[PDB]
Structure formats: structure tokens, C-alpha cells
Ligand binder design. Structure first.
Ligand code: NAG
Ligand code: NAG
Ligand code: NAG
Ligand code: NAG
Length: 263
């Protein structure tokens, strides 16, 4: 069927590995954050139609800088992306999930706000969640509590419980092989293995420390391709991205790859 959510040119490995997607990106600081500490909104100026919204949360002690690279990278492919700072840098996963969802709520509110740069740019029914470490755990809590979310793609996630068997949202877990903060064997892989009801994927970056998917990482072509492909496939229902979303990269930079129920 004609997909009313399809945006942008037909993807290629090259187009998805590039630093920038097809759309021009602008950004603004949120003047009065509603339910979180601070936020930057990244948006395409020329997507050609309304686009989904993604909210991204940092890890413990961390700020927008740790996750900022996702803002332009995703927005340039046709998303409105909010990177947040938490109320406290020492907020835990449940609080991070609440704040992530408050950020999505504010982006949806701004779609209806005539003074906003994202006035009329958002499809409030199509949302995604991403984040690092405790903000990754928070993303999985967000998905568990809000199953109408269309996609989740946390990185090096941690939560006090690894049991996300209730999650029905398509979930891509970025993991870091040599993580010594939230070891893969005790955190990311148990989380991945808990999820039985969803499309899901596990992508472990070989030799990576806990920060392996953060701003300034040396694998932006692969990690950015996978994140954009997952969000395109599931937030936009865009089957042009089915092979990019589901494929094993068969990459010497990937130490572990798993996927299930992917189409
Ligand atoms: C974040 O702080 C705002 C402002 O005080 C508040 O409305 C919100 O409830 C806080 N969120 C959490 C999860 O503590
Ligand atoms: C966002 O606003 C635009 C223009 O007013 C509108 O066409 C669109 O439906 C809105 N989004 C949602 C999800 O209602
Ligand atoms: C996770 O929680 C579900 C729901 O209680 C339970 O049936 C299951 O045993 C737990 N799963 C794991 C993977 O420990
Ligand atoms: C991985 O290899 C399989 C089997 O040869 C192939 O179907 C798939 O395209 C490969 N992935 C990439 C990125 O080429």
C-alpha cells in the first residue's frame, strides 16, 4: 500500500552511513521545559510531511553532550528529535522514563503552538525512545508503560531489573563489548533475552567501553545507519528499510549480533 509516512529518497548503505541525511536540520533550546531539566529540539526544515518524534536521555552524571550526535543524524532523515537534560544528573531509570515521556509530550504540544519552529511538523501518533545507560533503561521502561510507542533504540542500557518481557515495541539494543559499568552479560544481553513479544535486535560494538555509542564515537556510520534504519522501519512503517533494519551487518566492528521477529 501507499505509505503516508514514507519520507525522503530511497535509502542506500551509502546514504545511511553518511554523516547527514537528505533533510536540512535546525534546532532550538526549549524555553520552559515541562517535566524535565532542559532540552534541545532538532527538526528537518524540508521533510515534505509531518514526521515522528524521538526523545533521547543521557546516562547517570551525563548531559545532552553525550547523546547530542543523534539529534542532527536522526532529524536529517525525517524526525523531530529532543535531547534532554534530566532534572538531576543523578536521576534513576524510572525518573528518566517519566522525563523522556514529558519531553515527547512537550514536542507534541509544540506541534500545536503557532510560535514554535516545529508547528505542524510532528505526527504526535508516531514516537520513539532512545537513551544511554540509565536513560537506556528509562527508554525500555517508557516502552513497557507506553506500548503505542513505535520504536525503542537504547544504548548500553541499565535498569535495576533486566526483565522487559512485557515490551511489545520494536527494540534495538546497542551494546558495548567491553562495558565495565553495565556489563553486557549482566545488563544489555539479559535485557535483550527477556523480550519475547517484539521485533528486536542486539548490536554489540567490538572493544567498546560504556560510551561506545555516544557523541564522538568512531562507529557513527554503522551505529547511525542502524539507528536511522530501525526508526524509519518502525516509526514510519517504512519497509524500504526492512533489510537495513533486520540485516546482520556481517561487520568486523560488531562482536555480537542477534535479531528476532524482524521484518
Ligand atoms: C522534573 O522536574 C519537574 C519540575 O520540578 C517536575 O514537574 C517533574 O515531576 C520532575 N520529574 C521527575 C520524574 O521527578
Ligand atoms: C500537527 O499540526 C499540523 C498542522 O496544524 C497538523 O496538520 C497535524 O495533524 C498535527 N499533528 C497531529 C499528530 O495531530
Ligand atoms: C519476567 O517477568 C515475567 C512476568 O512475570 C515472568 O514470567 C518471567 O519469568 C520473567 N522472566 C525472566 C526472563 O526472568
Ligand atoms: C550478511 O550476510 C548475509 C548472507 O550472505 C546477507 O544476506 C546479508 O546481506 C549480509 N549483510 C550485509 C550488510 O551485507
Amino acid at each position: 500500500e501507499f505509505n503516508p509516512y514514507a519520507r525522503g529518497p530511497n535509502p542506500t548503505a551509502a546514504s545511511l552511513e553518511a554523516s547527514a541525511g537528505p533533510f536540512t536540520v535546525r534546532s532550538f533550546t526549549v524555553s520552559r521545559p515541562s517535566g524535565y531539566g532542559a532540552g534541545t529540539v532538532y527538526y528537518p526544515t524540508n521533510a515534505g510531511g509531518t514526521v515522528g518524534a524521538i526523545a533521547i536521555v543521557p546516562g547517570y552524571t551525563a548531559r545532552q553532550s553525550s547523546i547530542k550526535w543523534w539529534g542532527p543524524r536522526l532529524a536529517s532523515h525525517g524526525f523531530v528529535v529532543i535531547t534532554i537534560d534530566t532534572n538531576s544528573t543523578l536521576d534513576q531509570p524510572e525518573s528518566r522514563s517519566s522525563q523522556q515521556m514529558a519531553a515527547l509530550r512537550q514536542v507534541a504540544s509544540l506541534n500545536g503552538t503557532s510560535s514554535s519552529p516545529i508547528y505542524g511538523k510532528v505526527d504526535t501518533a508516531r514516537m520513539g525512545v532512545m537513551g544511554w545507560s540509565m536513560g537506556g533503561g528509562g527508554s525500555l521502561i517508557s516502552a513497557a508503560n507506553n506500548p503505542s510507542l513505535k520504536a525503542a533504540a537504547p544504548q548500553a542500557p541499565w535498569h535495576s531489573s533486566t526483565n522487559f518481557s512485557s515490551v511489545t515495541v520494536p527494540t534495538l539494543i546497542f551494546a558495548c563489548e567491553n562495558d565495565s559499568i553495565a556489563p553486557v552479560n549482566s545488563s544489555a544481553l539479559p535485557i535483550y533475552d527477556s523480550m519475547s513479544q517484539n521485533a528486536k535486535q542486539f548490536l554489540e560494538i567490538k572493544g567498546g567501553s560504556h560510551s561506545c555509542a555516544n557523541s564522538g564515537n568512531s562507529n557513527q556510520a554503522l551505529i547511525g545507519k542502524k539507528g536511522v534504519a530501525w526508526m524509519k522501519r518502525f516509526m514510519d512503517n517504512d519497509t524500504r528499510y526492512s533489510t537495513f533494519a533486520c540485516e546482520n551487518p556481517n561487520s568486523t566492528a560488531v562482536s555480537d549480533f542477534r535479531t528476532a521477529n524482524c521484518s
